[PDB]
Ligand SMILES: COCCCc1cc(Nc2nc(NCc3cc(C)no3)ncc2Br)[nH]n1
């Protein structure tokens with residue numbers, strides 16, 4: 001990987017067919033830019049490109065490659081951010097993926113405090129669909145949150161950061177979406193992502209609310225150990241609150257599965 | 273030590289002391305002729321100082337001046353001569369409002385929407401009365417509201433001596449909660465207490481009622497509380513709460529003290545809302 005990467009003709013795009021545009025966002029040693037891809041024959045497709053920052057290390061490269069390779073194995077679904085291609089040869093790695101013009105679901109919800117009760121349940125349905133798909137492909141997210149759900153021009157929910165390779169790192173605290181087993185016992189399962197979906201559900205029905213405002217890490221632990229559970233939001237049926245509460249069962253085996261959650265939300269949507 | 277006050281003195285032999293309530297004891301007063309009335313009696317503990325006596329006397333004298341209202345814990349008498357000071361006050365059999373509401377949470381009989389709005393009305397009435405007598409509570413919370421056998425709300429601890437320049441903000445209550453979470457910012461940061469800061473605390477109490485004894489800012493320590501307040505943070509609307517009653521809480525938590533409603537206004541609004549609530 002130091003002088004050259006392996007080629008995968010299934011996915012390789014010519015660099016002349018990609019025009020890089022305005023940055024969308026960055027992270028530790030990776031960054032995401034808006035771009036235009038020609039012929040993924042001669043139609044331009046607005047895509048998002050993920051690539052390393054200039055200060056990245058060999059291990060950052062190896063992380064980014066592993067992310068791309070997981071996206072290949074997992075395959076396509078409408079409610080996830082899909083791999084569309086890659087430039088791997090003769091220069092920096094560009095991992096080309098779908099563009100979601102409306103940004104993350106947290107912001108999306110906050111800027112519309114105008115969604116109906118149906119639309120809100122529909123969001124929740126789409127997210128669980130994406131998660132039901134990923135879980136069928138052995139994919140555990142480990143940070144399912146509204147910040148990691150992107151929304152498209154046409155209001156499709158698309159899970160992101162599912163292929164990625166310090167409890168005090170924030171400006172909110174991710175530990176506030178972690179299942180107790182994952183936080184306390186470092187047990188990550190599909191059921192631990194169910195707990196996280198519980199909190200996303202709550203974010204959804206508070207239209208982008210912040211879990212546990214003002215609660216620092218040590219206190220959160222203390223709340224968890226006491227069996228504390230966030231209060232029902234206003235503008236939330238008692239059914240939905242029991243879905244959240246169900247996702248928040250202490251025993252993961254008694255939490256519902258994403259398969260079960262999709263079935264319920266499909267029913268609930270139709271009756272909203 | 274004590275000076276005699278014939279307006280209030282009950283002979284010691286007329287008071288039959290019973291079980292501890294939590295110091296405060298349950299008692300029976302004979303007379304107050306051949307009838308016994310259940311009463312609560314406040315008295316000193318064994319390890320009490322002269323400062324503690326002084327503070328108990330001040331509380332009693334304050335009750336004398338304030339006079340009687342249905343929605344406060346009313347002074348009934350005192351034993352001041354030839355033995356321990358006993359301040360005799362009304363008995364509330366169903367305990368504090370926090371516990372009263374939590375015991376009535378669904379799985380004791382549930383409270384209607386009207387019952388909850390009626391609690392709010394009665395507390396506001398008591399506060400309006402206290403305000404009228406020039407009294408500022410300084411720790412209005414559901415824990416300092418007591419409930420009688422016939423479900424009458426009575427405000428307690430309204431006459432208490434407190435040095436505000438010696439408050440421990442870190443000190444938790446017995447239930448595990450922090451009293452700073454009921455305090456107007458201007459009282460908290462600037463030690464300025466007014467009827468207006470009491471109205472702020474009433475907003476928090478209204479919140480406590482509609483969450484059926486919920487704990488404000490759960491898991492938020494003192495330093496983080498300050499930072500939420502400085503940022504103008506406000507608690508979210510409880511579920512099963514009208515927009516109209518959440519607007520009331522929000523009004524009580526106005527950042528500018530002059531712009532909060534008075535208890536006179538709160539009393540009138542709540543009266544109107546009680547009559548229209550199912
Ligand atoms: C590897 O795929 C990462 C997501 C690709 C993507 C990004 C967008 N649109 C937007 N992205 C961002 N920030 C980049 C980002 C957010 C997350 C989560 N991950 O990366 N900001 C605004 C927009 Br609009 N579409 N597809």
Ligand SMILES: COCCCc1cc(Nc2nc(NCc3cc(C)no3)ncc2Br)[nH]n1
Pocket residue numbers: 293294296312314345361362363364365366367368415416417418428429
């Ligand atoms: C001088 O006013 C003291 C309150 C008089 C009173 C107390 C009760 N009933 C109960 N009291 C307590 N704990 C003592 C207490 C609570 C507060 C507030 N202040 O003192 N526990 C249970 C009951 Br029931 N009735 N009247």
